[PDB]
Design a protein around this ligand. Structure first.
Ligand SMILES: CCCCCCCCCCCCO[C@@H]1O[C@H](CO)[C@@H](O[C@H]2O[C@H](CO)[C@@H](O)[C@H](O)[C@H]2O)[C@H](O)[C@H]1O
Ligand SMILES: CCCCCCCCCCCCO[C@@H]1O[C@H](CO)[C@@H](O[C@H]2O[C@H](CO)[C@@H](O)[C@H](O)[C@H]2O)[C@H](O)[C@H]1O
Ligand SMILES: CCCCCCCCCCCCO[C@@H]1O[C@H](CO)[C@@H](O[C@H]2O[C@H](CO)[C@@H](O)[C@H](O)[C@H]2O)[C@H](O)[C@H]1O
Ligand SMILES: CCCCCCCCCCO[C@@H]1O[C@H](CO)[C@@H](O[C@H]2O[C@H](CO)[C@@H](O)[C@H](O)[C@H]2O)[C@H](O)[C@H]1O
Ligand SMILES: CCCCCCCCCCO[C@@H]1O[C@H](CO)[C@@H](O[C@H]2O[C@H](CO)[C@@H](O)[C@H](O)[C@H]2O)[C@H](O)[C@H]1O
Ligand SMILES: CCCCCCCCCCO[C@@H]1O[C@H](CO)[C@@H](O[C@H]2O[C@H](CO)[C@@H](O)[C@H](O)[C@H]2O)[C@H](O)[C@H]1O
Ligand SMILES: CCCCCCCCCCO[C@@H]1O[C@H](CO)[C@@H](O[C@H]2O[C@H](CO)[C@@H](O)[C@H](O)[C@H]2O)[C@H](O)[C@H]1O
Ligand SMILES: CCCCCCCCCCO[C@@H]1O[C@H](CO)[C@@H](O[C@H]2O[C@H](CO)[C@@H](O)[C@H](O)[C@H]2O)[C@H](O)[C@H]1O
Ligand SMILES: CCCCCCCCCCO[C@@H]1O[C@H](CO)[C@@H](O[C@H]2O[C@H](CO)[C@@H](O)[C@H](O)[C@H]2O)[C@H](O)[C@H]1O
Ligand SMILES: CCCCCCCCCCO[C@@H]1O[C@H](CO)[C@@H](O[C@H]2O[C@H](CO)[C@@H](O)[C@H](O)[C@H]2O)[C@H](O)[C@H]1O
Ligand SMILES: CCCCCCCCCCO[C@@H]1O[C@H](CO)[C@@H](O[C@H]2O[C@H](CO)[C@@H](O)[C@H](O)[C@H]2O)[C@H](O)[C@H]1O
Ligand SMILES: CCCCCCCCCCO[C@@H]1O[C@H](CO)[C@@H](O[C@H]2O[C@H](CO)[C@@H](O)[C@H](O)[C@H]2O)[C@H](O)[C@H]1O
Ligand SMILES: CCCCCCCCCCO[C@@H]1O[C@H](CO)[C@@H](O[C@H]2O[C@H](CO)[C@@H](O)[C@H](O)[C@H]2O)[C@H](O)[C@H]1O
Ligand SMILES: CCCCCCCCCCO[C@@H]1O[C@H](CO)[C@@H](O[C@H]2O[C@H](CO)[C@@H](O)[C@H](O)[C@H]2O)[C@H](O)[C@H]1O
Ligand code: NA
Ligand code: NA
Ligand code: NA
Ligand code: NA
Ligand code: NA
Ligand code: NA
Ligand code: NA
Ligand code: NA
Ligand code: NA
Ligand code: NA
Ligand code: NA
Lengths: 89, 89, 89, 89, 89, 89, 89, 89, 89, 89, 89
C-alpha cells in the first residue's frame, strides 16, 4: 500500500467516526430542554425569583452540556489534529 | 492511488459523516418542544408573567440549541471547508 | 479514476448523507407535538386566553423547528448544490 | 466506468437515502399522538367545547407534521426527480 | 454493465430502502397508543361521554397515522412501481 | 450477470429489508402497553365502567396495531410474493 | 455464480434480517412493563380487586405482545423455513 | 465456492444476527425497571399488602421478559444449533 | 479458503456481534435507575422504612438486570467459548 | 491468508465491537440522572433525611451502573486482552 | 499484507469505534438535564435550601456522568494510545 491510500482510508473513517460522535449531542438537547421547561414553569409561579431560577438553569444546563463538548472535541481532533497521520507517514 | 481517487473517497465519507452529525438535531427538537409546551400552559395560567415566561423560554431553548449548532458546524466544515483535502495533495 | 467514477461515488454518498441528516426531523415532530397537546389542554381550560396560547404555541414550535430546517438545508445542498463536485478536477 | 454503472450506483444510493429520510416520520407520529391524547381527555371534561378543542388539535398537529413532509419531499425527489442524474450525463 | 446487473442492484437497494422507511411506523404505534390510553382513562372517568371520546380518539389517531402511510406508500412504490427502472435506458 | 446472481442479490437484500421493516413493531408494543396500563388503573378505580374500559382499550390498541401490520405485510411480501423476481428473467 | 454461493449469500442475509426483526422485541418489553407497573400500583391501592386487575393486565399485555410474536415468526421462517431457497434452484 | 467458505460467511452473518437480536433486551430492562419502581413505591405505602404487590410485580415482569427470551433463544439457535449448516453441506 | 481465513472472518464477526449484544445493557441502566429514583423518593417519605425500601429496590433491579446478563453471557461466549470454531476446523 | 492479515481483520472488528458495546453507557446516564433528580427534590422536602437520601441515591445508582461496567470490561478485553489473537495460526 | 495496510485498516476501524463509543454521551446529557430541571424547581420552591440542592445536583450529575467518561477514555485510547498497533509489527 502507498501513503496516499493509507491517508485516504484513515481520514475517510475519521470523517465517519467524527459524525458518529456528534450524534451524542441529541442528549444535551433533550436534557437541557427539560431544564428550560422547568425554569419556564417556575418563573410563571414566581416571576420575581426569575434571576435565581435562570442562574440555576444555566448551571445545570452547563453540566449537561459536557458530553456534547466531549464529542465535539473528538470530532475536531479527528478533523483538524488527526492522531493517526503520524503513524502512517 | 491517484489524487482524484483520494479526494473522491474522502469527500464521500465526509458527506456521510456530515449526515450522521446532523442526526443530533433531533435532541433540541424534542427538548425545546418540551420548553415550548411548558410556556404554553404557563402563559395560560399566569398571564401577568407572560413577558418573563417567553423570555425564559427563548433563553432556555437557545442553550438547548447549542449541540444542534455544533453538528451543523461540523457538517458545514465537512462540506465547504474540508480539512482532509490539504492532507492529500 | 475517471471523472464519472468520482462523481458517482461522491453523489452516491451524498444521497445517503442527505437521508441520514433528515432523520433529525423526528425530534421537532415529537417536541412540537408535545407543545400542541399542551395548547389543546390550555384552550380547554382557558378559552379566553386562546389568542395568547396559540401565539405562544406557534413561537415555541417555530424555535423547535430549527434543527429540522438545518437538516433540510444540508440535504438540499447535497442534492442541488453539491459542494464536492467542484473539487473533482 | 460506463454510464449505466454510474446511474445504478447513484440511484441505488438514492433509494437507501430516501428510506433513511422517511425514518423521521416516527417523530410526528409520536408527537401528534400526544396531541390526540390531550384532545381526548379535554373533550371528556368539556364535551360542549369539542369544536374548539379539535381545531386546536388540528393546528398543532399540522405544525408537528412538517418535518415528516420534508422527508417525504426529499424521498419523492430522490425517487421521481433525481438531481444527481443530470450531473452524471 | 449489462441491464440485468443494473436492475439487480437498483431493486436490491430499493428493498433495503423500503425496509428503512417502514421503521417510521413505530412512531404512530407509540403516539396512537398514548391516545388509546387517554381514551380508556377518559371513558373510565366520563363514561357518559364515551361517544365523543371515541370519535376524538379516532380522528387524532388518524392524523398521527399519516407518516406511517407515507412510508408505506414509498415502500409500495419501491416494490411495485419502481421509478428507477425506466432511468437505466 | 447470470439469473442466479440476480435472484441472489435481490432476495438477499429483500431478507434484510424485511427485517428492517419489522423493527417498527416496537412502536405498537410500547403504545398498546401504555393503553393496557391505563386500562388496569381504570378498571381498578372504576369497576362499573369495566366493559366499556376494555372495549375502549381493545379498539385503541387495534388502531395502534396497524403500522405493525403494515410492516408484517411488507415483510411477507418480500418473503413469499417477491415483486422483484419478475423483473429479472 | 454456483448454487452454494447463492445459498450462502441468501442465508447469510437471512440471518441478519432475522436479528433485525427481533429488535422489535424491545417494544413489548417496555409497554408490558408499564402495564405491570400499573397493576402493581393498582393492587396496592385496592387488593379488593386483585383478580380483575391482573386479568386486565394479562389481556392488555397479550395484545402488546403481538408485534413481538410477528418478529419471532419472521425470524423462525428465515431460519427454519426459508422461502428464498426454492427460488434459487 | 468451497464448503469452508460457505460455513464461514453464514456463521459470520449468524454471529452478527445473534447480536442484533440481543439488542431487544433493553426493552424488558426498561419495562421491568418501571414495574420495580412502582413496587418500591407501593410496598412502602401499603406494607400490609407487600405479598400480593411483590407477586404482582414478579408476574408482570415475567410477561415483559418474554421478548428478551425470544431473542436469547434465536441467538442460542444461531450459535449452537445453526439451521443454515445443513443447507450448505 | 484456508482455515486461518475461516477463523479470521468468523471471529471478526463474533466481535461485532458481541458488541451489538452489549447495547441492550442500556435498558436495565434506565429501568433500574427509575427504581432507584422511586426508592430515594420513598426513603425521603419514610426514612424508618429504609431497609425495607432498599430490599424491594434490589429485588426489582435484579429482575430488570436479567437481559443485561443475557447479553453479557452471549458476548463472553462469542469471545471465550466460540461455538463456530468447531464447525470450521 | 498470512498471520498479519488475520490479526488485522480481527483487531479491526474488535475495535468496532468495543465501540458498539460502549453505546450501552447511555442507559446508566439516563437512569442515574433520574435518581439524581428525585434526590434533588427529596433533600429539598426532607433535609432531615438528607443522609439517608444520598446513601440510597448512591446505592441505587451503583446498581444501575453495572451494565455500563460490563460493556467497559468487554471493551477493555477487546482492546487489551484480546482473546482472538491466540486462535490465529 | 504489508504493515502500512495493517495499520491503516486497524486505525480506520479504531476511528469508527471511537465515534460509536461517544454516542453513549447522549445518556448523561438527558439524565443530568433531568437533575438540572428538578434543581430549578426545588430551588424556586425552597430558596433557603439552595446550597444543599445544588450540592445534591452536582453529586448526582457527577455519578451519571461516569459512563460518558468511560466512552471518552475508550475513544482517547483508540486515538492516542492505540493498543492494537503493537500487535501488528
Ligand atoms: C470542557 C471543555 C473541553 C474542551 C477543551 C479540551 C482541550 C482543547 C480541545 C479543543 C478541540 C480540538 O481542537 C483542535 O485542537 C488541535 C490540537 O489538539 C488543533 O490542531 C493543531 O495541531 C495540528 C497538528 O500538528 C497543527 O496542524 C496545528 O498546530 C493545529 O491545527 C486544532 O487547530 C484544533 O481545532
Ligand atoms: C458557531 C459557533 C459555535 C460552535 C463553535 C465550533 C468551534 C469549532 C470551529 C472550528 C475550530 C477549528 O478551527 C480551525 O483551526 C485550524 C487550526 O489548525 C485552522 O486551520 C488553519 O491552520 C492550520 C494549522 O497551521 C493550517 O495548516 C491550515 O491551512 C489553516 O486552515 C482552521 O482554519 C480553523 O477553522
Ligand atoms: C441560527 C444559525 C444560522 C442559521 C442560518 C444559516 C443556516 C446555514 C446556511 C448555510 C448555507 C450556505 O452556506 C454557504 O454557501 C455558500 C455557497 O456559495 C458557500 O460558498 C462556498 O461555495 C461556493 C460555490 O460556488 C464557492 O464559490 C465559495 O468560494 C465557497 O465559499 C459558503 O462557504 C457557505 O458558508
Ligand atoms: C472499516 C475500515 C475498512 C478499511 C478497509 C480497507 C480496505 C482495503 C485494504 C487494501 O489493502 C491492500 O493491500 C495489498 C497488500 O499490501 C496491496 O498490494 C500491492 O502488491 C500488491 C500485489 O502483491 C500490488 O498490486 C500493489 O502494490 C498493490 O496492489 C494493496 O495496494 C492494498 O490496497
Ligand atoms: C466507514 C468508512 C469506510 C471507508 C472505506 C474506504 C475504502 C477505500 C478503499 C480504497 O481501495 C484501494 O484503492 C487504491 C488505489 O486504487 C488501491 O491501490 C492498489 O490497488 C490498485 C488496484 O488494483 C493498484 O492499481 C494500485 O497500484 C495499488 O497500490 C488499493 O488496492 C485499494 O485497496
Ligand atoms: C460511508 C462512505 C463509504 C464510501 C466508500 C467509497 C469507496 C470508493 C472505492 C473506490 O474504489 C477504487 O476506485 C479506483 C478507481 O481508479 C480504483 O483504481 C483502479 O482501478 C483499477 C482497480 O479496479 C486498477 O487496476 C486500475 O489501475 C485503477 O485505475 C481502485 O482500485 C478502487 O479501489
Ligand atoms: C453509502 C455509499 C458509499 C459509497 C459506495 C460506493 C460504491 C462504489 C463502486 C465503485 O465501482 C467502480 O467501478 C468502476 C468500473 O470501471 C471502477 O473503474 C476503475 O477500475 C476499472 C478496472 O477494470 C478500470 O477499467 C476503470 O478504468 C477504472 O476507472 C472503479 O474503480 C470502481 O470504484
Ligand atoms: C447502497 C450501496 C450500493 C453499492 C452499489 C455498488 C454498485 C457498483 C458495483 C460495481 O462493480 C463493478 O461494476 C462494473 C460494471 O458492471 C463491472 O464492470 C467492469 O468492467 C470494468 C471494471 O473491471 C469497467 O471499467 C468497465 O467499464 C466494466 O465493463 C466491474 O467488474 C464490477 O466490479
Ligand atoms: C447492494 C447491492 C450490491 C450488488 C453487489 C455486486 C455487484 C457486482 C458487479 C456486477 O456483476 C459483475 O457484473 C459484471 C457485469 O456488469 C460481470 O461483468 C463481466 O461480465 C459481463 C457480461 O456482459 C462483461 O460485459 C463485463 O465486461 C465483465 O466484466 C460480472 O458478473 C461481474 O464482474
Ligand atoms: C446487502 C448485500 C446482499 C448480498 C450481495 C452479494 C453480492 C455477491 C457478489 C456479486 O456477485 C457477482 O457475481 C459475478 C458472477 O455473476 C462475479 O463475476 C464473474 O463473472 C464471471 C463468473 O460468472 C467471471 O468469470 C468473470 O470474469 C466475472 O466478471 C462477480 O465477481 C461477483 O461479484
Ligand atoms: C450486508 C448484511 C447481510 C450479509 C451480507 C453477506 C455478504 C457475503 C458476501 C460473500 O462474498 C461472496 O463470496 C463468494 C465466494 O464464492 C464470491 O464468489 C465468486 O467466486 C465464485 C467462484 O468462482 C463465483 O461462483 C461467484 O459468482 C463469484 O462471485 C462472491 O463474489 C463474493 O461476493
Ligand atoms: C454484517 C455483514 C457480515 C459479513 C460477514 C462475512 C464477510 C465475508 C467477506 C469475505 O468473503 C470472501 O469471499 C471470497 C470469494 O473468493 C473468498 O475467496 C477465497 O475462497 C473462495 C472459495 O470459493 C475461493 O474461490 C477464492 O479463490 C479464495 O480466494 C474469501 O475467502 C471470503 O473471505
Ligand atoms: C463484521 C464484518 C467482518 C468482515 C471481514 C471481511 C474480511 C475480508 C478479508 C479479505 O478478503 C480476502 O478475500 C480472499 C479472496 O478474495 C480470501 O482468500 C484468500 O486468502 C488469500 C488472500 O490473498 C489468497 O491469496 C489465498 O489464495 C486465499 O485463500 C481471504 O481469505 C480473504 O481474507
Ligand atoms: C467491519 C470492519 C471490517 C474491517 C476490515 C476489512 C478487512 C479486509 C480488507 C481487505 O483485506 C485483504 O486481506 C488480504 C489478506 O487476506 C491482504 O493481502 C492479500 O493480498 C496481498 C497482496 O495485495 C498478499 O498477502 C497476497 O497477494 C494477499 O494476501 C489484502 O491486502 C487486504 O486488502
Ligand atoms: Na455532563
Ligand atoms: Na446545549
Ligand atoms: Na431549535
Ligand atoms: Na414541524
Ligand atoms: Na401525521
Ligand atoms: Na395505527
Ligand atoms: Na400488539
Ligand atoms: Na412479553
Ligand atoms: Na429481566
Ligand atoms: Na445494573
Ligand atoms: Na454513572
Amino acid at each position: 500500500m502507498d501513503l496516499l491510500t493509507a491517508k485516504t482510508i484513515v481520514l475517510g473513517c475519521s470523517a465517519v467516526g467524527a459524525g458518529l460522535a456528534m450524534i451524542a449531542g441529541l442528549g444535551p438537547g433533550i436534557g437541557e430542554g427539560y431544564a428550560a421547561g422547568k425554569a419556564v414553569e417556575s418563573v410563571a409561579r414566581q416571576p420575581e425569583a426569575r434571576g435565581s431560577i435562570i442562574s440555576t438553569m444555566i448551571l445545570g444546563q452547563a453540566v449537561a452540556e459536557s458530553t456534547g463538548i466531549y464529542s465535539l472535541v473528538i470530532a475536531l481532533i479527528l478533523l483538524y489534529a488527526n492522531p493517526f497521520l503520524s503513524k502512517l507517514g
